[PDB]
Each structure stands twice: as structure tokens, then as C-alpha cells.
């Protein structure tokens, strides 16, 4: 993922990008969505706006990190792509990592609205006019937000250990799955059990 040279944003907040293969983690969530160019910077702790306040809120003590690469060749078609919506009205802000898909018509005023648009009563959602002929910052941006965690349960998912070639009949410093020391490695005429 890191040395892909095909991404735009790979900022990692809680942990170092190069220490990912070292730390061992319990469970890994992975969120995904598509947003505008000028709103990728809003996917960060302590940010505000119409897409971070009540569309996708990241906790301040965030530990995973955010990946976002421009794709103006799959989600943008002539005449626009009206399959990508976003909420811009809500009663109140979002606590971190919350999902809201209800489509109750938002009421800005004190007037009862009764499920139909009217004066000071807006529809909650809004679409993206994803035109292929748009400047950068209005083009779609696919986003993935990895989010690591440390649970009291034992760690299950983490990176590959880099093995090396074995050497026989010399004095070296061995290490196999945790056991470590020094000595001479040689074949032995013994029998073990598969466990």
C-alpha cells in the first residue's frame, strides 16, 4: 500500500507508516466512500464542515489512517453521475464513527412539515454533479479510512515476518518464531511429532 505511487493522500496519524509491519493489531476496520476533491482535507481529526460534521466524524484520538486517490475515470460520466449523494442537513452533529441513513425531511423552522418539502423544510440529501470536464478539487476522490484497534482479545492480524536463508555448520545467531540464541546449526537424526 505504501509504495504504490498511485495514491494522493496516505497520511497516518496514530502510528508510523513504516512501523505498520511491526506492530500487531487485534481487529482492522476499513471504511470506504467517494467525496469531492476539496473535501478530502476534512477527513481528519478536529475538522469541521458539511461532510465531516454530520457525514463522517473521525475521533480526536484516532489511530488508523486515511487513504485517498483521485479517480476521474470510473465514477464520472458525461451528463453527471447522480448515484453519489451526501447529507448536508441534520438536527445535530455526529459523534465519531456513526452512521445515519434516515431520510426524514429536515425542518429548519418551527413549522410542522408533514413529510413534504415546503417553506423552511429542506430535503436532507444532495447529489454530486460528477462531470468529466471539471477542474481538480471538484473531481471524485475515492477514500479508504483504515482504523486499527487494541482489544483485550489476543492480536490476530498483523504483518508478515521477513525470513532469511538458513546456514549450517557455522556459528550464527538463530531465531525461529521467538526462540533466540547462538550456536551451530546441523541436521539431526531425530523424530518429532506433527505438533
Amino acid at each position, epitope marked *: 500500500l505504501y509504495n504504490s505511487a498511485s495514491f494522493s493522500t496516505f497520511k497516518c496519524y496514530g502510528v508510523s507508516p513504516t512501523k505498520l509491519n511491526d506492530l500487531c493489531f487485534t481487529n482492522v476496520y476499513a471504511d470506504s466512500f467517494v467525496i469531492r476533491g476539496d473535501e478530502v482535507r476534512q477527513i481528519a481529526p478536529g475538522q469541521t464542515g458539511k461532510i465531516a460534521d454530520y457525514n463522517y466524524k473521525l475521533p480526536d484520538d484516532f489511530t488508523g489512517c486515511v487513504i485517498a486517490w483521485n479517480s476521474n475515470n470510473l465514477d464520472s460520466k*458525461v*451528463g453527471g453521475n*447522480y*448515484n453519489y*449523494l451526501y447529507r448536508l442537513f441534520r438536527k445535530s452533529n455526529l459523534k465519531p464513527f456513526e452512521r445515519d441513513i434516515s*431520510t426524514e*425531511i429536515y425542518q429548519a423552522g418551527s413549522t410542522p412539515c408533514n*413529510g*413534504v*418539502e*415546503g*417553506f*423552511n*423544510c*429542506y*430535503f436532507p*440529501l*444532495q*447529489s454530486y*454533479g460528477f*462531470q468529466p*470536464t471539471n477542474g481538480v478539487g471538484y473531481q471524485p476522490y475515492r477514500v479508504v479510512v483504515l482504523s486499527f484497534e487494541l482489544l483485550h482479545a489476543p492480536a490476530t492480524v498483523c504483518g508478515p515476518k521477513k525470513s532469511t536463508n538458513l546456514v549450517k555448520n557455522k556459528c550464527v545467531n538463530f531465531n525461529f518464531n521467538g526462540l533466540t540464541g547462538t550456536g551451530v546449526l546441523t541436521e539431526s537424526n531425530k523424530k518429532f511429532l506433527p505438533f
Partner: antibody, heavy 121, light 108 residues
Framework: EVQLVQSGAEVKKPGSSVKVSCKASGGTFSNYGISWVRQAPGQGLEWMGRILPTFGTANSAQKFQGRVTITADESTGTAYMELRSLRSEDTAVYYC??????????????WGQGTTVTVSS | EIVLTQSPGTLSLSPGERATLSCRASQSVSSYLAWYQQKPGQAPRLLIYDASNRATGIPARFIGSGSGTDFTLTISSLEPEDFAVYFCQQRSNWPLTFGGGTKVEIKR
């Protein structure tokens, strides 16, 4: 390049009913949002009401309440603008136009072609 | 119910000059205003949305500005296909009322 094919001219009589259809050329509907605009002969435009096809929501302007009824048929991708109790001054050219699934913002980017409706006796 | 008002009524000019159309509102609309162009016997088409954004395919000679309760659409290089009636619609809240019109004529 979404196209909005519309109906043809319909001469009618006062007190009758009319049903103007705005079919989306290209198949079915999407998150469009469709609003109905009429223009009196040799005058300015007027906005009557809008419909949300896929989300099922529609009502007309405060002046036109109780008279206009906008419905959608997602199976074929066709919107209806049934207008009852036609009055002598309700003769105009009726348009349909997609305006983005919203209430404020973008605007009417693709228009139909006009359905001249003459209401006389 | 916000009421718009365009001025002047006809605004006659000559080819190659500059136009100036005003759409002062009745209440405050933040930045939501669309400008439509209607040639005779045709369907209106969108030119400027959000009071400063040019729609796709529109020539660059159309520029919009203003905010609050006084907007302005300005045409730099008038051409024969720029003489029509120009409408402004306030897309703020219910209902989305239109404006009067400005039949940009030709001088001789």
C-alpha cells in the same frame, strides 16, 4: 447527455383535466429530482412543483395546492403532472427539467421541449 | 416568498459591447442564484449557477458575481447568439421563484 422527451400539444376545454408526461430518454430514473415550469404566452416563467422520483416525494407551489398532482413511474421512467379544474388562463407552454436531488443549489440543467396546452371553448 | 426584480427592462445594446444585468432580491440569499437564457421559441438553458459557477459548455465570456441581495451577470464580448431574454431564479427556499426578464436587443 440525459434527454427528457415530452408529450404533444393537447387542446382541452375549461373545467376538464390534463396529464402531461415527461419521459426520461435513456431508460429508467435515478436521483434526478424533476420540477415543472410553465410559461404564459409572451410572459416570464413560473415554477409550479417538483418531484423526487426514486425517493417518492412531491408537492406543488402554495398557489397550486389542491389542483396539481405530480406522480412518477420508476418502472418506465416517466413523470406525470395531472392538472385538474383547468381554467381559461391556465393555457401556456409546460416544461419539465431535472434539477439535482436537492432543494437548493445547482439548478435546471436539462430541459424538455414544451407541451403547448390550449384551454378554450 | 422572495420576490426578485431585474433591471432594466430592455437594455438595448450593440454587438461587441458589454452587458450588465441586475437581479436585486427582496431578502437575503447567500450565494444561490441561477441565470437562464431563453432564445425565442425554445427552452431556457442554464448559464450561471451558485452565482459564480459557469455551467458546462458555456463560453467563457459569461461571468457572474454579487452575493447577498444584489447580483450581477456581465457579458464581455456580445455576439449575435447572445441576444435573448435572461432570467434569474433564487434557489434558496420554497418556492423557487423566477424573475421578470431582460430582452437584450440590438441597436442601429
Amino acid at each position: 447527455e440525459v434527454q427528457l422527451v415530452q408529450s404533444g400539444a393537447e387542446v382541452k376545454k375549461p373545467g376538464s383535466s390534463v396529464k402531461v408526461s415527461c419521459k426520461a430518454s435513456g431508460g429508467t430514473f435515478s436521483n434526478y429530482g424533476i420540477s415543472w415550469v410553465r410559461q404564459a404566452p409572451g410572459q416570464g416563467l413560473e415554477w409550479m412543483g417538483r418531484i423526487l422520483p426514486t425517493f417518492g416525494t412531491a408537492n406543488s407551489a402554495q398557489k397550486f395546492q389542491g389542483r396539481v398532482t405530480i406522480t412518477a413511474d420508476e418502472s418506465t421512467g416517466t413523470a406525470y403532472m395531472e392538472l385538474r379544474s383547468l381554467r381559461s388562463e391556465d393555457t401556456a407552454v409546460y416544461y419539465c427539467a431535472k434539477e439535482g436531488l436537492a432543494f437548493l443549489g445547482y439548478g435546471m440543467d436539462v430541459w424538455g421541449q414544451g407541451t403547448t396546452v390550449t384551454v378554450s371553448s | 416568498e422572495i420576490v426578485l426584480t431585474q433591471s432594466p427592462g430592455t437594455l438595448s445594446l450593440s454587438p461587441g459591447e458589454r452587458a450588465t444585468l441586475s437581479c436585486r432580491a427582496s431578502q437575503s440569499v447567500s450565494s444561490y442564484l441561477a441565470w437562464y437564457q431563453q432564445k425565442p421559441g425554445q427552452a431556457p438553458r442554464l448559464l450561471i449557477y451558485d452565482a459564480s459557477n459557469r455551467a458546462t459548455g458555456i463560453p467563457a465570456r459569461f461571468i457572474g458575481s454579487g452575493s447577498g441581495t444584489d447580483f450581477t451577470l456581465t457579458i464581455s464580448s456580445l455576439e449575435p447568439e447572445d441576444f435573448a431574454v435572461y432570467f434569474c431564479q433564487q434557489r434558496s427556499n420554497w418556492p423557487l421563484t423566477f424573475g421578470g426578464g431582460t430582452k437584450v436587443e440590438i441597436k442601429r
